[PDB]
Design a protein around this ligand. Sequence first.
Ligand SMILES: CC(C)CN(C[C@@H](O)[C@H](Cc1ccccc1)NC(=O)O[C@H]1CCOC1)S(=O)(=O)c1ccc(N)cc1
Lengths: 99, 99
Amino acid sequence: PQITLWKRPIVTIKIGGQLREALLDTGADDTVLEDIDLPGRWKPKLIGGIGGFVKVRQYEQVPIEIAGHKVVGTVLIGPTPSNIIGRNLMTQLGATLNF
Amino acid sequence: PQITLWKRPIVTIKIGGQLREALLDTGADDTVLEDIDLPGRWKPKLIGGIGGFVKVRQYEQVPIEIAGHKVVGTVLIGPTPSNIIGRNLMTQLGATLNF
Ligand SMILES: CC(C)CN(C[C@@H](O)[C@H](Cc1ccccc1)NC(=O)O[C@H]1CCOC1)S(=O)(=O)c1ccc(N)cc1
């Protein structure tokens, strides 16, 4: 698809058999989800945004479906006011910004 | 232009006779710049990001050039680890996300 930016670029995701929504976020290097429990081993990691920093669980080689496209990559789990898909996964969709 | 997302989508801006760089940020509703002082009246505003909240100055009807395109709109000034161009201004470029 091609979408305009008059509203937030929210898409449907499926991860670990759970369905959620997430914001396509060209400002975010990495994907961050709050409302999802993932199984298996993880690494503690601190991410920085506007206002300060949050402790996140880093999960690697996570299968995730984004707007219908199966990819596998790194998903961070921790507090975020919005689930965000970052460039780590948007590059696997071949996503582009156009203006 | 069309850009891919293997690197951060950074563009050159000109605002108030000052040249800066900023991130094209589909995850950001509003534009936020740190490293620039703007003239005239403003309104206090609090914005929320991943890591809490910051106090910003809201400046309205600010002339700004983004990757060569003159627009006028609202610019928030306050602490941000990266200057960000949000959807408020990217909609004036006719920007789209494609995948
Ligand atoms: C340069 C920063 C700002 C990058 N952030 C992404 C931005 O899109 C961020 C995403 C977000 C959406 C909803 C609520 C809160 C935050 N929008 C944001 O703060 O919107 C504010 C600023 C004005 O408009 C509102 S991040 O979330 O800190 C981040 C950082 C690192 C990683 N790996 C992942 C995410």
